[PDB]
Amino acid sequence: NALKSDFDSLRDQITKAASNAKFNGVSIADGTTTKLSFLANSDGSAFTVTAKTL
Amino acid sequence: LNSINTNSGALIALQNLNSTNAELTQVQQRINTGKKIGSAKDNGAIWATAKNQ
Numbered sequence: 001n002a003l004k005s006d007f008d009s010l011r012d013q014i015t016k017a018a019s020n021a022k023f024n025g026v027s028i029a030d031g032t033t034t035k036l037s038f039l040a041n042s043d044g045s046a047f048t049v050t051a052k053t054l
Numbered sequence: 055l056n057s058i059n060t061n062s063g064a065l066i067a068l069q070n071l072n073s074t075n076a077e078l079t080q081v082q083q084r085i086n087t088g089k090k091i092g093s094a095k096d097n098g099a100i101w102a103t104a105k106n107q
Contacts, residue, residue: 023107024103024106024107
């Protein structure tokens, strides 16, 4: 039961540590979106970065 | 052309000098403040995002 409580504490620290990693209201690793694109050219070409859920 | 009154070339030189002075002004605030976006006057979007974050 002690190792069970330790495992549950570690798994919900993973939950909060993954959920709280935002920047400017946006996160590539919380799973809220499939990808994010950033400017790469003057004509509006984007630089794709596929999201990797954690 | 050729007149004691109007002299447009000095006006154009004053315009270029005022532009160089305004550029010196922005460079001085960027050097002393240390931020590329030191105020909402510089760029409101990045400035508001930076203050919120």
